[PDB]
Design an enzyme around this catalytic site. Structure first.
Site, PDB file in Angstrom:
ATOM      1  N   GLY A   1      96.321 -72.627 -55.541  1.00 15.95           N
ATOM      2  CA  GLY A   1      95.251 -72.588 -56.519  1.00 15.95           C
ATOM      3  C   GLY A   1      95.561 -73.484 -57.694  1.00 15.95           C
TER       4      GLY A   1
ATOM      5  N   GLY B   1      94.285 -74.274 -62.128  1.00 12.94           N
ATOM      6  CA  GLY B   1      93.571 -73.851 -63.318  1.00 12.94           C
ATOM      7  C   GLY B   1      94.041 -74.658 -64.506  1.00 12.94           C
ATOM      8  N   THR B   2      93.423 -74.383 -65.660  1.00 12.66           N
ATOM      9  CA  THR B   2      93.807 -75.087 -66.881  1.00 12.66           C
ATOM     10  C   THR B   2      95.281 -74.891 -67.201  1.00 12.66           C
ATOM     11  OG1 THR B   2      93.569 -73.475 -68.669  1.00 12.66           O
ATOM     12  CG2 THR B   2      91.556 -74.250 -67.589  1.00 12.66           C
ATOM     13  N   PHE B   3      95.858 -73.759 -66.785  1.00 15.37           N
ATOM     14  CA  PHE B   3      97.279 -73.512 -67.006  1.00 15.37           C
ATOM     15  C   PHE B   3      98.154 -74.462 -66.199  1.00 15.37           C
ATOM     16  CE2 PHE B   3      95.802 -70.868 -63.559  1.00 15.37           C
ATOM     17  CZ  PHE B   3      96.768 -71.041 -62.585  1.00 15.37           C
ATOM     18  N   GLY B   4      97.711 -74.857 -65.016  1.00 18.54           N
ATOM     19  CA  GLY B   4      98.519 -75.674 -64.134  1.00 18.54           C
ATOM     20  C   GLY B   4      98.142 -75.463 -62.669  1.00 18.54           C
TER      21      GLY B   4
ATOM     22  N   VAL C   1      99.151 -73.313 -58.878  1.00 17.65           N
ATOM     23  CA  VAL C   1      99.832 -72.256 -58.139  1.00 17.65           C
ATOM     24  C   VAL C   1     100.055 -72.748 -56.717  1.00 17.65           C
ATOM     25  CG1 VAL C   1      99.828 -69.847 -57.447  1.00 17.65           C
ATOM     26  CG2 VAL C   1      98.697 -70.534 -59.568  1.00 17.65           C
TER      27      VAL C   1
ATOM     28  N   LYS D   1     103.641 -70.086 -59.751  1.00 22.45           N
ATOM     29  CA  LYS D   1     102.675 -70.606 -60.706  1.00 22.45           C
ATOM     30  C   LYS D   1     103.434 -71.508 -61.671  1.00 22.45           C
ATOM     31  CE  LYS D   1      99.734 -68.837 -64.472  1.00 22.45           C
ATOM     32  NZ  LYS D   1      98.797 -67.749 -64.866  1.00 22.45           N
TER      33      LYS D   1
ATOM     34  N   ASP E   1      90.168 -62.183 -69.316  1.00 20.68           N
ATOM     35  CA  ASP E   1      89.778 -63.208 -68.352  1.00 20.68           C
ATOM     36  C   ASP E   1      89.375 -62.618 -67.006  1.00 20.68           C
ATOM     37  OD1 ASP E   1      89.148 -65.825 -67.836  1.00 20.68           O
ATOM     38  OD2 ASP E   1      91.178 -66.432 -67.253  1.00 20.68           O
TER      39      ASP E   1
HETATM   40  N1  LIG Z   1      99.893 -64.686 -55.893  1.00 22.19           N
HETATM   41  C1  LIG Z   1      98.915 -65.537 -55.566  1.00 22.19           C
HETATM   42  N2  LIG Z   1      98.599 -65.687 -54.259  1.00 22.19           N
HETATM   43  C2  LIG Z   1      97.622 -66.534 -53.926  1.00 22.19           C
HETATM   44  N3  LIG Z   1      96.870 -67.297 -54.722  1.00 22.19           N
HETATM   45  C3  LIG Z   1      97.204 -67.131 -56.007  1.00 22.19           C
HETATM   46  C4  LIG Z   1      98.190 -66.295 -56.505  1.00 22.19           C
HETATM   47  N4  LIG Z   1      98.251 -66.375 -57.888  1.00 22.19           N
HETATM   48  C5  LIG Z   1      97.322 -67.248 -58.188  1.00 22.19           C
HETATM   49  N5  LIG Z   1      96.651 -67.749 -57.102  1.00 22.19           N
HETATM   50  C6  LIG Z   1      95.558 -68.726 -57.115  1.00 22.19           C
HETATM   51  O1  LIG Z   1      95.749 -69.585 -58.230  1.00 22.19           O
HETATM   52  C7  LIG Z   1      94.640 -69.458 -59.147  1.00 22.19           C
HETATM   53  C8  LIG Z   1      95.045 -68.552 -60.284  1.00 22.19           C
HETATM   54  O2  LIG Z   1      94.226 -68.741 -61.432  1.00 22.19           O
HETATM   55  C9  LIG Z   1      93.479 -68.968 -58.302  1.00 22.19           C
HETATM   56  O3  LIG Z   1      92.869 -70.078 -57.647  1.00 22.19           O
HETATM   57  C10 LIG Z   1      94.169 -68.080 -57.265  1.00 22.19           C
HETATM   58  O4  LIG Z   1      93.503 -68.002 -56.022  1.00 22.19           O
END
Ligand SMILES: Nc1ncnc2c1ncn2[C@@H]1O[C@H](CO)[C@@H](O)[C@H]1O
Length: 361
Positions: free
Chosen positions: A27, A29-32, A34, A49, A152
């Site tokens: 995944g 997001g603005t944070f970075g 995952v 993450k 959020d």
């Molecule tokens: N533990 C996780 N397992 C699977 N996808 C995750 C996990 N943590 C975050 N993500 C993904 O990363 C992003 C988190 O904001 C989303 O797109 C989410 O689907």
């Protein structure tokens, strides 16, 4: 920094090229970003993450680490559906860039992923109910057992526990979900009312925009929004303008008893607080107590195409009562308990868990 599958993260003695090996993207997001990883120590799948090399997102990540330490301490099994944080470290880059990394349990796709994979078709009401019950249990846990507000609540931050998921990629009413992303959460045990701009736009509560102080109740608003989305497969509030957003709120709830967008109390001119500045910017959206719509969309222009498109977009916004079929009346009432403009009217999550929509099932 751009990362490819095969590279490592978090170098240790036994593994100088990284304890965690990248297997797939998970995944963004603005944070970075995952990323799905193989833990060379425990030989399991984890989700790492990685935060962007910025200071603000680093502070947010450290707040997430702290809150998740508390949450994993008070609920290790995660009976209350909050993501388990296994570890955390700092990965240095070839260019000297330092990124915070949080290692979580490896989960499945998000609720947003589910809605997209099914072409944004409405999610069935029983699965909606299962997900909403577990999410409400998590929100109850946070708010009432930890005095923490998430801010959020969005479909992207609700993930499917893979054991519930199936290779046919069709979730059922037995799905198990986890709430994630505590990088924006705040503890309210000492200061329970804030005024900073929080929440993703589409799920942002009106008190946050208007400047009358937000607290736990804002999460409930987000929850309500999410529910409506799950009922239709579509984002409820599709706008990035404050005037248009407040007008869409007013339109969705115009025929709901006592739901009117009201401006904040005007502060003193000798007030320099963040809240007073937000209140001034919000009052700039009103004229004589009424929301300056649609004339405020293009004030200078007497004949504007943007104003006409805003008129069309607000006309397309349905009334809340018209969204739901008759057989789902109960759900409607449940969402009425959440989508109120006055935060003081919204139910507590523990009270919502006792609504007929749940305990009559
Ligand atoms: N533990 C996780 N397992 C699977 N996808 C995750 C996990 N943590 C975050 N993500 C993904 O990363 C992003 C988190 O904001 C989303 O797109 C989410 O689907």
């Amino acid at each position: 920094v751009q990362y490819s599958v095969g590279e490592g993260l978090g170098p240790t003695a036994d593994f100088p090229n990284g304890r965690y090996q990248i297997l797939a993207p998970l995944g963004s997001g603005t944070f970075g970003k995952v990323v799905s990883c193989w833990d060379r120590v425990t030989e399991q799948l984890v989700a790492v993450k990685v935060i962007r090399a910025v200071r603000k997102y680093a502070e947010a990540a450290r707040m997430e680490i702290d809150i998740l330490l508390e949450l994993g301490r008070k609920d290790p099994t995660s009976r209350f559906h909050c993501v388990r944080m296994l570890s955390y470290f700092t990965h240095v880059s070839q260019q000297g860039n330092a990124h915070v990394c949080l290692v979580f349990e490896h989960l499945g796709p998000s609720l947003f992923d589910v809605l997209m994979r099914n072409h944004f078709r409405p999610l069935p009401v029983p699965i909606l109910r299962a997900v909403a019950r577990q999410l409400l249990e998590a929100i109850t846990f946070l708010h009432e057992h930890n005095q923490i507000v998430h801010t959020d609540i969005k479909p992207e931050n609700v993930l499917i526990v893979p054991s519930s998921y199936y290779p046919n990629r069709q979730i059922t009413e037995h799905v198990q979900v986890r709430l994630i992303d505590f990088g924006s959460a705040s503890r309210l045990d000492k200061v329970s009312v804030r005024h900073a701009i929080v929440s993703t736009r589409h799920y942002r509560a009106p008190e946050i925009i208007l400047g009358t102080g937000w607290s736990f109740a804002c999460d409930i608003w987000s929850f309500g929004a999410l529910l409506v989305e799950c009922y239709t497969g579509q984002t409820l509030f599709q706008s990035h303008d404050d005037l248009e957003h407040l007008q869409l709120m007013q339109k969705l709830l115009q025929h709901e008893n006592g739901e009117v967008i009201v401006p904040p109390p005007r502060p003193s001119p000798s007030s320099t607080s963040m809240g007073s500045q937000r209140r001034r910017e919000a009052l700039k959206l009103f004229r004589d107590g009424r929301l300056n719509w649609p004339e405020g969309i293009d004030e200078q222009s007497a004949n504007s195409l943007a104003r006409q498109k805003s008129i069309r977009r607000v006309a397309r916004m349905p009334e809340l009562h018209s969204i739901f079929r008759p057989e789902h009346a109960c759900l409607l009432h449940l969402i009425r308990c959440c989508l109120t403009i006055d935060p003081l009217k919204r139910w507590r999550p523990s009270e919502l868990l006792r609504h007929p929509f749940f305990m009559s099932y």
